[PDB]
C-alpha cells in the first residue's frame, strides 16, 4: 500500500486514473495503466513489446477490450486487480534491489496478472520474451609490441599530455578516415608543428568515446627505425606488423612515412596492395616537400591518401598550447610557471629561434627553464655548505688534538671547540629553515604527482565499470591527498610571507626564460628584454650605427616597416617595397644588409637577383629559382640590383606579388611573399632629381611601391666619419693585444681624399686600408716593431704615403 514510486511511474498512474475517469469508470484498472503506457510519447512499454516480438496493434486492442468492459457510473478507487498490479510491481522492485517502483516494474507486473498476461501471449510475447527485453534495457600481438607504440594505451594510462587547439583537424582526420576513397589522412607539416600530437589527440578521443562507433580502434604508431635495427629481414618484420594490424583491425600512424616509400629500404609494394584492398587504414606524417616527391608523384598513392595540412601555430595559439601543458611541467619539475614566462617563451622563440617551429621550440624553452629552476632548488645552499665544511675541518682537528697533552694543544683544542659551537649557533637555524621549506615543497610535488596518477587510474576504473576501485579512489584517496596538499599550500604561503626575502625560488618567470634564450643564441640578456615596440621605435638608431649620412633614407625605410608591423598595411601585399634611387657607393646595399639583420634575425637571409642576366625574354621561367628561394627561407629581403636591366616580363611579375601577396610557381604552387621585403636599386637639389625619375617610369608599377628614396652624396663631414668608423674596426681587433692606433690628421685626410671616389663612393676605402695601413702594420706586429700595450703611431711620410711609425728596431 504505502510504497514509493519514481516521478515517471507516478505520472503513469495518475494518467491511468485520468483515462479511467474519461470513460467514466468507477475505479482504476490495470488495462488503463497498460494502455496509457503504450500511448506515451516514445513509449518504453511499446519499445519493449516490439523488441520482445509482439504485435503492438493487437496487444493494444486487446488491452482496450478488457478496459471497455469495466463498470461505469455517473473519488477514484483502485480495483482489487490494480492493488494486485502494485503488489507485483513492488515485488519486482525488491527482487531487482531497487528502491523506487519504476515503469519497468509496472511492465513486468502486467505479466503477472493472468488477465494481462493473456493479451500479451496473443500478441506473441512469452514471459521469457518479456523478461529478457526488460533486463536488457536496464543494463596478445607479438610484432606490434616489438615495433609499434600502442598510442591508445598511452592515452588510457594518462601518460600523454593534453592536445590543445587542434579539434578542427582531429575531426577532419575522422571524416577522412570515413570516406569511401582518399580515406587515409597524410598529416603534412614541418618538424615540431604537432603532427604526432594530432595522432595522439585522436587516440585520446577514441579512449573517451568522442568518436563515431566506426573508430573504436586501437591506434599504433609504427617505429620505422625499429624495423631496420638488426639485419632482406626488413620486409619480413613489416609483413608481420601489417598482418597483426589487419586483424586487430587497427589504425596505423606512420611518422616519416616517406622513408618507407622511397627515402633506408623501400616497402611501397608491401603497403600499396593492402591500402588499396582497404585492409589497412593509415595516418601518415611527412613534410610538404617530401609529400610532393613521394606521395603525389605516384598516382596510386594520391588516390588513397588525403593531404591534411598542419600549419605552425601562431604566437597567440602557442601561448594557449603552453597554458594547457603548464600544469604537466609544473607537476613534473615541482615548480610554478608564471604566465609571463609562458608569454615570453612564445614571443622569444618566435623571434630568436628562427630555424625551428612552434610549439616544439617554446615547450623546449619551458622544459629547460623548469629544469634549471629545479637544479637550483635541489642544490645545497651555499651558506649551509660553507659552515658544514668548516665545522668538519674543525672536528677532524679536534679529534687529533683530543689526546695531545702539551699546554699548546689543550689551548688550541679549546679554540676549536669555541669555533665549532659558534658555527653550530649560526648553522642550526639556517638548516632547519631549509629542511622545512624544502621538505614542504617536495611534498607538494610528490602529492601533486600522486593526484594525477590517481585521477587517471580512476578514469580507467570508470571506463571499465570497476565501481569499487573508482569509488576507493574518487571519494577516499583523492580527497585525502587534496586536503593534505591544501594544508601545505597554506603553510607555504604563510612561511613565505614571514621570510619576506623578496625571492621566488621555485618560480619560472621571464628572467629564467631569457637565461635560456641567451644561452641558445649567445645574445646577451640585456639585448633580449627590449620589447618589439622599443626595438621598432629605435630602429633608426640601429641603422645609424653603420649607415652614415643617410638619415632621410632611414626615416623613410623605418616608417614603412612600422606601417607593416602595426597591422595598418593590406595583408594582400608584401611587408614593404622600396625603390632606392641614389648614387652608388652611398649605402644602398648596406641598408639591405641592415634590414635582414634587424627584421629577420639573420644578416645573411638576403636573396640577390642580378637583373642583367634575367634580361632574357624567357628569363621568367628560370624565375623556377625565384620561387624556391622564398619558399626555403620565407623570412627574407629580396634585392633587385640593376633594376634598369629588368625586362617588362619581370617588371610585371612583381606587380603580382605586390598587389596579390604571393607568386605562382611554374608548376602551379603558391610561394608565399607575405613576409618578404622587396628592394630595387637604380642609378637613374634633391627636389630636382626626384622628378628626373618621374620622367621615365610606368605609373602603375611605381605607385604599387611604398617608398621611393633619393640618397644624398657623402659630404666631406660624412667622409671623415666613415673613415673614423673603419679605423674603429681596426682598433677593435688590436684591443686583445692592448695596442692603440693613433692616426693623425695627415693620414685621415689621405684616407679621406684617396679612399673616396666621386661615382663609386666608399668602395675603395677598404683596399686602401689593407694596402696602405694594415700591410705594414702586420709587418710590425710580427718583427717586434709594435708590441702589445703600445701606441702604434700612424702618419704620412715626406713622399706622400701612409706610414706606421715603428717603436723598435729589427
Ligand X SMILES: Nc1ncnc2c1ncn2[C@@H]1O[C@H](COP(=O)(O)OP(=O)(O)O)[C@@H](O)[C@H]1O
Residue 308's φ and ψ, nearest 5 degrees, are -120, 105
Binding of residue 679 to ligand X (CB under 6 A): no
* Count of residues interacting with ligand X (CB under 6 A): 35
Residue 80's φ and ψ, nearest 5 degrees, are -50, -30
Residue 324 CB, nearest approach to ligand X (Å) = 6
Residue 611 CB, nearest approach to ligand X (Å) = 14
Bin 278: left if φ > 0, else alpha if -120 < ψ < 50, else beta: left
Binding of residue 626 to ligand X (CB under 6 A): no
Q: Which three cell numbers stand for residue 36?
A: 496509457
Q: Which of 588, 658, 682, 748 binds ligand X (CB under 6 A)?
A: 588
Binding of residue 722 to ligand X (CB under 6 A): yes
Binding of residue 258 to ligand X (CB under 6 A): no
Binding of residue 62 to ligand X (CB under 6 A): no
Binding of residue 345 to ligand X (CB under 6 A): no
Q: Which of 32, 105, 195, 281 binds ligand X (CB under 6 A)?
A: 195
Among positions 739-798, residues that touch ligand X (CB under 6 A) are 761-763
Q: Which is nearer to ligand X, 328 or 808 (CB)?
A: 328
Q: Which is nearer to ligand X, 79 or 318 (CB)?
A: 318
Residue 162 CB, nearest approach to ligand X (Å) = 6
Binding of residue 166 to ligand X (CB under 6 A): yes
Task: Count Cα atoms within 13 angstroms, Cβ side, for 465.
Answer: 1
Distances (CA, A) of 211 to 5, 196, 248, 734: 37, 19, 18, 70
Residue 192 CB, nearest approach to ligand X (Å) = 5
Q: CA 649 to CA 633: how far, in whole Å?
A: 25
Rg (CA), the chain: 42
Q: Which is nearer to ligand X, 444 or 586 (CB)?
A: 586
Binding of residue 363 to ligand X (CB under 6 A): yes
**662-664/670-672 β-pairing:** antiparallel
Beta partners for residue 308, in sequence order: 187
Binding of residue 186 to ligand X (CB under 6 A): no
Q: Which is nearer to ligand X, 261 or 401 (CB)?
A: 261
Can you say whether the dihedral through the CA atoms of 248, 254, 260, 262 is positive or negative? Answer: positive
Binding of residue 171 to ligand X (CB under 6 A): no
Q: Which three cell numbers stand for residue 485?
A: 596538499
Binding of residue 549 to ligand X (CB under 6 A): yes
Residue 564 CB, nearest approach to ligand X (Å) = 23
Q: CA 214 to CA 180: how far, in whole Å?
A: 13
Binding of residue 163 to ligand X (CB under 6 A): yes
Which single residue is written with the C-alpha cell 498476461? Answer: 117
Q: Which three cell numbers stand for residue 135?
A: 533486463
Among positions 391-450, residues that touch ligand X (CB under 6 A) are none
Which single residue is written with the C-alpha cell 594582400? Answer: 572
Binding of residue 43 to ligand X (CB under 6 A): no
Q: CA 543 to CA 554: how far, in whole Å?
A: 7
Residue 168 CB, nearest approach to ligand X (Å) = 11
Q: CA 308 to CA 286: how far, in whole Å?
A: 10
- For residue 90, the Cα-to-chain-centroid distance in whole angstroms is 59
Binding of residue 165 to ligand X (CB under 6 A): yes
Number of H helices, E strands in the chain: 37, 20
Binding of residue 203 to ligand X (CB under 6 A): no
Question: DSSP character for 313?
Answer: P
Q: Which three cell numbers stand for residue 464?
A: 571499465
- CB-based contact 110:142 (threshold 8 Å): no
Binding of residue 161 to ligand X (CB under 6 A): yes
- CB-based contact 785:810 (threshold 8 Å): yes
Q: CA 147 to CA 728: how far, in whole Å?
A: 62
Residue 430 CB, nearest approach to ligand X (Å) = 40
Binding span for ligand X by CB under 6 A among 186-194, 405-413, 448-456, 665-673? 186-194
Binding of residue 727 to ligand X (CB under 6 A): no
Residue 364 CB, nearest approach to ligand X (Å) = 8
Instruction: Return the axis-axis angle of helices 407-463 and 382-401, rounded to nearest 10°.
Output: 140
Residue 336 CB, nearest approach to ligand X (Å) = 20
SS3 184: strand
- CB-based contact 604:682 (threshold 8 Å): no
SS3 606: strand
Q: Which of 192, 284, 510, 785 binds ligand X (CB under 6 A)?
A: 192
Q: Which is nearer to ligand X, 194 or 785 (CB)?
A: 194
Binding of residue 196 to ligand X (CB under 6 A): yes
Q: What is the 3-state secondary structure (H, E, C) of 339-362?
A: HHHHHHHHHHHHHHCCCCCCCHHH
Q: Which three cell numbers stand for residue 501?
A: 626575502
Binding of residue 587 to ligand X (CB under 6 A): yes
Nearest to 611 by CA among 576, 588, 639: 639
Binding of residue 35 to ligand X (CB under 6 A): no
Binding of residue 548 to ligand X (CB under 6 A): yes
Q: Which is nearer to ligand X, 44 or 553 (CB)?
A: 553
Q: CA 749 to CA 686: how far, in whole Å?
A: 28
What x-and-dash track marks residues 566-585 binding ligand X by CB under 6 A?
------------------xx
Using CB atoms, what's the residue nearest to ligand X? 194
Which uninterrupted H or E stretch holds 285?
strand 281-286
Q: Which is nearer to ligand X, 586 or 626 (CB)?
A: 586
> How many beta carbons lie within 10 A of that of residue 448, not counting itself?
17
Binding of residue 603 to ligand X (CB under 6 A): no
Q: Which is nearer to ligand X, 632 or 763 (CB)?
A: 763
Q: Which is nearer to ligand X, 524 or 604 (CB)?
A: 604
Q: Which three cell numbers stand for residue 177?
A: 578516415
Q: Which is nearer to ligand X, 297 or 763 (CB)?
A: 763
Binding span for ligand X by CB under 6 A among 64-72, 234-242, 468-476, 543-551? 543-551
Binding span for ligand X by CB under 6 A among 141-149, 193-201, 232-240, 558-566? 193-201
Q: Which of 360, 437, 594, 706 binds ligand X (CB under 6 A)?
A: 360
Binding of residue 191 to ligand X (CB under 6 A): yes
Q: Which three cell numbers stand for residue 387?
A: 659552515
Binding of residue 10 to ligand X (CB under 6 A): no
Residue 133 CB, nearest approach to ligand X (Å) = 46
Q: Which three cell numbers stand for residue 654?
A: 612583381
Binding of residue 185 to ligand X (CB under 6 A): no
Q: Which of 359, 510, 574, 785 binds ligand X (CB under 6 A)?
A: 359
> How many beta carbons lie within 10 A of that of residue 657, not counting itself?
24
Q: Is the peptide bond preceding residue 318 cis, with omega within 30 degrees of 0?
A: no
- For residue 572, the Cα-to-chain-centroid distance in whole angstroms is 27
Binding span for ligand X by CB under 6 A among 187-195, 257-265, 525-533, 780-788? 187-195
Q: Which is nearer to ligand X, 29 or 205 (CB)?
A: 205
Among positions 262-291, residues that touch ligand X (CB under 6 A) are 285
What x-and-dash track marks residues 285-324 binding ligand X by CB under 6 A?
x-----------------------------------x---
Q: State the residues that interact with ligand X by CB under 6 A.
A: 161, 163-166, 189, 191-197, 285, 321, 325, 359-360, 363, 546-550, 584-590, 722, 761-763
Amino acid at each position: 500500500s504505502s510504497m514509493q514510486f519514481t516521478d515517471k511511474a507516478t505520472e503513469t498512474l495518475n494518467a491511468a486514473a485520468k483515462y479511467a475517469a474519461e470513460n467514466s469508470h468507477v475505479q482504476l484498472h490495470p488495462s488503463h495503466v497498460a494502455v496509457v503506457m503504450l500511448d506515451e510519447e516514445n513509449s518504453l512499454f511499446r519499445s519493449i513489446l516490439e523488441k520482445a516480438g509482439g504485435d503492438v496493434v493487437s496487444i493494444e486492442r486487446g488491452f482496450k477490450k478488457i478496459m471497455v468492459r469495466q463498470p461505469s457510473q455517473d473519488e477514484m478507487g483502485h480495483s482489487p486487480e490494480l492493488a494486485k498490479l502494485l503488489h507485483y510491481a513492488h515485488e519486482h522492485m525488491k527482487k531487482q534491489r531497487d528502491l523506487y517502483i519504476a515503469q519497468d516494474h509496472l511492465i513486468l507486473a502486467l505479466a503477472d496478472l493472468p488477465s494481462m498476461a493473456q493479451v500479451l501471449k496473443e500478441g506473441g510475447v512469452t514471459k521469457k520474451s518479456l523478461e529478457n527485453a526488460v533486463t536488457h534495457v536496464r543494463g596478445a600481438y607479438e610484432a606490434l609490441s616489438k615495433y609499434c607504440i600502442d598510442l591508445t594505451e598511452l592515452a588510457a594510462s594518462g601518460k600523454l599530455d593534453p592536445v590543445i587547439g587542434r579539434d578542427e583537424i582531429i575531426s577532419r582526420v575522422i571524416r577522412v578516415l570515413s570516406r569511401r576513397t582518399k580515406n587515409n589522412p597524410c598529416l603534412v607539416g614541418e618538424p615540431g608543428v604537432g603532427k604526432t600530437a594530432i595522432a595522439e589527440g585522436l587516440a585520446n578521443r577514441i579512449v573517451k568515446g568522442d568518436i563515431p562507433s566506426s573508430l573504436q580502434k586501437k591506434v599504433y604508431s609504427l617505429d620505422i627505425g625499429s624495423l631496420l635495427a638488426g639485419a632482406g629481414e626488413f620486409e619480413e618484420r613489416l609483413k608481420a606488423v601489417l598482418k597483426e594490424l589487419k586483424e586487430a583491425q587497427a589504425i596505423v600512424f606512420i611518422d616519416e612515412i616517406h622513408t618507407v616509400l622511397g627515402a633506408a629500404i623501400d616497402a611501397a609494394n608491401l603497403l600499396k596492395p593492402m591500402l588499396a584492398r582497404g585492409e589497412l587504414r593509415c595516418i601518415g606524417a611527412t613534410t610538404l616537400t617530401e609529400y610532393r616527391q613521394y606521395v603525389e608523384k605516384d598516382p596510386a598513392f594520391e588516390r588513397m591518401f588525403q593531404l591534411v595540412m598542419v600549419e605552425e601555430p601562431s604566437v597567440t595559439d602557442t601561448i594557449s598550447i603552453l597554458r594547457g601543458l603548464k600544469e604537466r611541467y609544473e607537476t613534473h619539475h615541482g615548480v610554478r610557471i608564471a604566465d609571463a614566462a609562458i608569454v615570453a617563451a612564445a614571443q622569444l622563440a618566435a623571434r630568436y629561434i628562427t630555424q625551428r617551429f612552434m610549439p616544439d621550440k617554446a615547450i623546449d624553452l619551458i622544459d629547460e627553464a623548469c629544469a634549471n629552476t629545479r637544479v637550483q632548488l635541489d642544490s645545497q645552499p651555499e651558506a649551509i655548505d660553507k659552515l658544514e665544511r668548516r665545522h668538519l675541518q674543525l672536528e677532524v682537528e679536534a679529534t687529533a688534538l683530543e689526546k695531545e697533552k702539551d699546554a699548546a694543544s689543550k689551548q688550541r683544542l679549546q679554540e676549536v671547540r669555541a669555533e665549532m659551537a659558534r658555527i653550530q649557533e649560526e648553522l642550526r637555524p639556517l638548516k632547519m629553515k631549509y629542511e622545512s621549506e624544502k621538505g614542504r615543497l617536495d611534498e607538494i610535488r610528490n602529492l601533486s604527482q600522486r593526484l594525477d596518477e590517481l585521477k587517471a587510474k580512476a578514469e580507467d576504473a570508470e571506463r571499465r565499470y570497476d565501481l569499487a576501485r573508482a569509488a576507493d579512489i574518487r571519494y577516499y584517496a583523492i580527497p585525502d591527498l587534496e586536503k593534505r596538499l591544501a594544508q601545505l599550500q597554506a603553510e607555504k604561503s604563510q612561511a613565505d610571507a614571514e621570510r619576506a626575502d623578496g625571492l621566488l625560488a621555485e618560480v619560472v618567470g621571464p628572467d629564467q626564460i631569457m637565461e635560456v634564450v641567451s644561452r641558445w643564441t649567445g645574445i646577451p640578456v640585456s639585448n633580449l628584454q627590449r620589447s618589439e615596440k622599443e626595438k621598432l621605435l629605435h630602429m633608426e638608431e640601429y641603422m645609424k650605427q653603420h649607415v652614415v649620412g643617410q638619415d632621410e633614407a632611414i626615416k623613410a625605410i623605418c616608417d614603412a616597416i612600422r606601417l607593416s608591423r602595426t597591422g595598418l598595411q593590406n595583408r594582400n601585399r608584401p611587408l614593404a617595397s622600396f625603390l632606392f634611387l641614389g648614387p652608388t657607393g652611398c649605402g644602398k646595399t648596406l641598408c639591405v644588409k641592415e634590414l635582414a639583420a634587424f627584421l629577420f634575425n639573420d644578416p645573411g637571409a638576403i636573396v640577390r637577383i642580378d637583373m642583367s642576366e634575367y634580361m632574357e625574354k624567357h628569363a621568367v621561367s628560370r624565375l623556377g629559382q625565384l620561387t624556391e628561394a622564398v619558399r626555403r627561407r620565407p623570412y627574407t629581403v629580396v634585392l633587385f640590383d640593376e633594376m634598369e636591366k629588368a625586362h617588362k616580363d619581370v617588371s610585371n611579375l612583381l606587380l603580382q606579388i605586390l598587389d596579390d601577396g604571393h607568386c605562382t610557381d611554374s608548376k602551379g604552387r603558391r610561394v608565399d611573399f607575405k613576409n618578404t621585403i622587396i628592394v630595387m636599386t637604380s642609378n637613374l637639389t634633391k627636389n630636382a632629381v626626384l622628378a628626373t625619375a618621374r620622367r621615365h617610369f610606368a605609373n602603375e608599377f611605381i605607385n604599387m611601391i611604398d617608398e621611393l628614396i633619393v640618397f644624398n652624396r657623402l659630404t666631406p663631414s660624412n667622409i671623415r666619419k666613415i673613415v673614423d668608423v673603419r679605423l674603429k674596426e681596426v682598433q677593435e681587433r688590436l684591443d686583445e693585444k692592448q695596442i692603440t692606433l693613433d692616426v693623425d690628421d695627415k693620414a685621415k685626410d689621405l684616407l679621406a681624399q684617396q679612399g673616396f671616389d666621386p661615382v663609386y663612393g666608399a668602395r675603395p676605402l677598404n683596399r686602401l686600408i689593407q694596402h696602405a695601413l694594415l700591410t705594414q702594420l702586420s709587418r710590425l706586429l710580427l718583427d717586434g716593431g709594435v708590441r702589445p700595450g703600445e701606441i702604434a703611431k700612424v702618419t704620412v711620410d715626406q713622399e706622400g704615403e701612409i706610414i706606421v711609425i715603428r717603436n723598435h728596431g729589427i
